Design a protein around this ligand. Structure first.
Ligand SMILES: [Zn+2]
Ligand SMILES: [Zn+2]
Length: 63
């Protein structure tokens, strides 16, 4: 017997131990999210790639 409090990231199929730091989970979960490298913005998986690409691309048409 033991606590099965395994945190599973909805974005993937990976199971994390109960001693897993939430902060690390946030980063992992966010890792799957669409993030702009020109400013460092986070875009949810449900977001529209068109809007994201426009935002990221917006960073290429202006320095
Ligand atoms: Zn994940
Ligand atoms: Zn950006």
């Amino acid at each position: 017997s033991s606590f099965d409090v395994h945190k599973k990231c909805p974005l993937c199929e990976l199971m994390f131990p109960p001693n897993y730091d939430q902060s690390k989970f946030e980063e992992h979960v966010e890792s799957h999210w669409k993030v702009c490298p020109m400013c460092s913005e986070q875009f949810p998986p449900d977001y529209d790639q068109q809007v994201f690409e426009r935002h990221v691309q917006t960073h290429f048409d202006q320095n």
